[PDB]
Paper text:
Here, we present the structure of an outer-membrane core complex from the iconic F-T4SS encoded by the E. coli pED208 plasmid solved by single-particle cryo-electron microscopy at 3.3 Å resolution. This 2.1 MDa structure, provides an atomic model of the TraB, TraK and TraV proteins and unveils unique stoichiometry relationships between the three proteins. Surprisingly, the complex is formed by two highly flexible concentric rings made by a total of 69 proteins chains arranged in two distinct symmetries. The components that make up this complex include the proteins TraB, TraK and TraV which are homologous to VirB10, VirB9 and VirB7 respectively and are observed throughout the multi-functional T4SS spectrum.
In the inner ring, seventeen ASUIR heterodimers made of TraBCTD and TraVNTD (labelled −8 to +8 in the clockwise direction) assemble to form the complete OMCCIR. In the ASUIR, an atomic model of the TraB C-terminal domain (CTD) and TraV N-terminal domain (NTD) could be built and refined into the electron density. The ASUIR is predominantly made up of TraBCTD which includes a total of seventeen β strands and three α helices. The core of the structure has a β barrel that connects to two anti-parallel α helices (α1 and α2) and a third helix (α3) towards the C-terminal end. The N-terminal end of the TraV (residues 17–54) is located entirely in the inner ring which includes a single helix α1. The ASUs +1 and −1 are contiguous to ASU-0IR and hence bury a much larger surface area of 2481 Å2 and 2435 Å2, respectively. The TraB α1 helix and TraV NTD residues Gly17-Ser23 define a rim-ward hydrophobic surface suggesting that this portion of the OMCC is likely embedded in the bacterial OM.
Numbering used by the authors:
A (entry chain J), B (entry chain h), C (entry chain f), D (entry chain F), E (entry chain B): 17 to 54
F (entry chain g), G (entry chain I), H (entry chain E), I (entry chain A): 195 to 327, 359 to 408
Amino acid sequence: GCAGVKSSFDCDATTSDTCMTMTKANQLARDKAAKQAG
Amino acid sequence: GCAGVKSSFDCDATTSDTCMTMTKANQLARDKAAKQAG
Amino acid sequence: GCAGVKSSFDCDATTSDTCMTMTKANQLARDKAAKQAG
Amino acid sequence: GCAGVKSSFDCDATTSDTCMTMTKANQLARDKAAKQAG
Amino acid sequence: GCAGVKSSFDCDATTSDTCMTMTKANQLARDKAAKQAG
Amino acid sequence: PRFPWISSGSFVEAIVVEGADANASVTGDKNTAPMQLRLTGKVQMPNDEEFDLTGCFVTLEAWGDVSSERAIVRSRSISCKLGDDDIDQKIAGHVSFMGKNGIKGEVVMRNGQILLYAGGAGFLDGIGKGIEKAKTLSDYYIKRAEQYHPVIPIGAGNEVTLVFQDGFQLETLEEARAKAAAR
Amino acid sequence: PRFPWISSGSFVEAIVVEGADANASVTGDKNTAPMQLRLTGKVQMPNDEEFDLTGCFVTLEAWGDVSSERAIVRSRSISCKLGDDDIDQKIAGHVSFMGKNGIKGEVVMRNGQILLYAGGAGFLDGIGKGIEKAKTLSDYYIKRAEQYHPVIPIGAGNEVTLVFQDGFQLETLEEARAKAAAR
Amino acid sequence: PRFPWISSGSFVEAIVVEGADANASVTGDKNTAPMQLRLTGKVQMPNDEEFDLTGCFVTLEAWGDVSSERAIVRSRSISCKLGDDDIDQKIAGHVSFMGKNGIKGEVVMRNGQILLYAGGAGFLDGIGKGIEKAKTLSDYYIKRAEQYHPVIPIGAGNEVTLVFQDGFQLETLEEARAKAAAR
Amino acid sequence: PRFPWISSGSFVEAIVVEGADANASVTGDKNTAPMQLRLTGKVQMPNDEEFDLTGCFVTLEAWGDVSSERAIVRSRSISCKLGDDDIDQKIAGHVSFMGKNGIKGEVVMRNGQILLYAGGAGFLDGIGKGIEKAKTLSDYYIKRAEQYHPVIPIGAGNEVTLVFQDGFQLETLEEARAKAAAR
């Protein structure tokens, strides 16, 4: 059969699995911080 | 079959699972305290 | 089957499960004491 | 039967198995570093 | 039945089993080094 | 000492800032999941009096129980910087939601697909044995479905009220170092 | 000391730079998979005040649990070079995503082909036994399918918020050597 | 000391020079297969600063795990001769590919012919027992097919990024002998 | 000392002079089969520099593993007579072929006739038992077929590259006796 109590989380917010290198994430973090400071 | 004694809590008041970040909850707490003080 | 000896308490006085916050119960206790003192 | 939860990684980025000697990889690393410095 | 995950290495580079004596391999190594130095 | 004595049983209205999923199994008290909330009221004290302690962080711990779909929370510490001083005391309090003890949610389980497959395998096995006039798959799927445990999810941004079970005297970091210098 | 006291419960918005696959099995807490993230905010402190600590690396550890499809992260250390000095302290913090504790993903399993073959062998065995009026292959395939364990994949470049469970005093390497020279 | 402090979490882009086949079995951590790669970038440090360390060899170790088709790599040592000096330090780092931890490949198994023969023998045995109105070969073939273990092959010439989990101070051989002469 | 420091990770192109058959069984690491190769390149060192060490013998050891059809080689010692001096040091290196670790061949087994006879005996036994409305030969043939173990053959005259896992200082025999005369 199925499970018991409701089998669902009521706010679906998963992570995005994109394949970017360490250096690209580093450059994105610089861009984010630079924008945020301004 | 079913359970025995009544299977229900008589005042349904659950929590709301909305996906907001720490900083957003922080800003909401500031708004709440600022309103309450006034 | 059923139970043995009588399965009933002869004075039904249960509690009321209303969902009110701590502060609301506190204010109700102030109201009660203030009325009682007068 | 099949598995349970989803049987797939959502960003397929595998390695390339080409048969090149140590010295050839060394020369490629020189080429890469020389280009990057310029 | 068969195996599970893919049963193949994706760059086939095996060794050559030729029957040559120690001294012949030695002379080949001399030839190789002499050519390489020039 | 410019700091009143927070008597046993004072409570303050707060708001959750970091939620968690309460580990609700026969062994959840030892696997706690940290939460956090932040004071947005005035500490209510027994004789209708207060002490302004707002805009401060108190860190918590959580673990749910399945019978009553609530998440039991045991406080850890406080943190306050009213002025040029710091505060870090340990609080043995707890958190109550909408009148009763512990925040309540809706218990959640995930063994839907695995249990479906196990039941299908068992039913097919039974009918296959019956109609003759698989079996070793079912035990694997049970052991795979038996490693979960129901969890109660708590959002971030719900209203709760912290309450101090045992009273204590609020003191800053410097006053703590100075008395620690005596002995 | 030109360095404020990072009180218990301060949090800072960050971004993941090295992902990982969370070992989500009955024994995952001991087989941790390192991640890493890098601070891109300002440390939020309890009384609406901050301390500029941006552009710094904090190294982590990870291990998922299957019930709640989240990846629990326990910080390891920090690293900062604001100016001509270095920083390397140990941080006992954690990481929360979108409000709740631990980053969430989608649990992933690979026993598709092996389980398919095992089930086919079992079904063929059952019908072959039934219709008479292989068997020793199935146990091998089960033991081959039983050595996996579901994993939760976490990309590199998602937004999270580090939070310091226990407060500490930020100090540089040189100030650490000098006090270590006393005793 | 003409050598900066390589803080915890710095990473450098590299390229694999010697591949390997990752021993991916229940016991692979103890049977490691050496790899090697060679630095072709500039060491990225936490506050957007670097240190030219290019054209140097760092030797590794490898062992894969089957669930996530990745090859976990634990560094061994470094080797550099910038100038007239030598360098040989021990590095406790690791290697990440395309964002996540460990280089990924495609797991490979070889029990095709042996398993085919074992299954054929078992099927023939079953039908031979059934239709009466070999057996001792099958156990030999299973024990011959049970001595393999899946491996993940890694080429030589793929791009990876080494990352130093724990910081250290780079020093040459001569500076190491001199301090070793003190005690 | 007219001899540079061979840093950790330097490699040199070589060529195999004595092949071997790699004992590839569950116990092969203890039954090693010696090989030998002879240096026909220039030692590549980390910062694009070299040291002429050509025309010298380095003796090895071998043992294969079946999963990856490779032959793992652990070096033993070196031998050089550049000039009027001798060299005999111990090298803890290994050998890599065509990019990856260990030389690769094609695994080879010989139980063709014995296994054929055992299978024939078993099949005849099964049908003889079945059609009634030899046996003690089969166990002997299994025990005779179970004393082999697959081997990987390596020719003599293939190209490989030795690589030194741990660095060392090259010294001649006389310089070794003189320092041994001190203590």
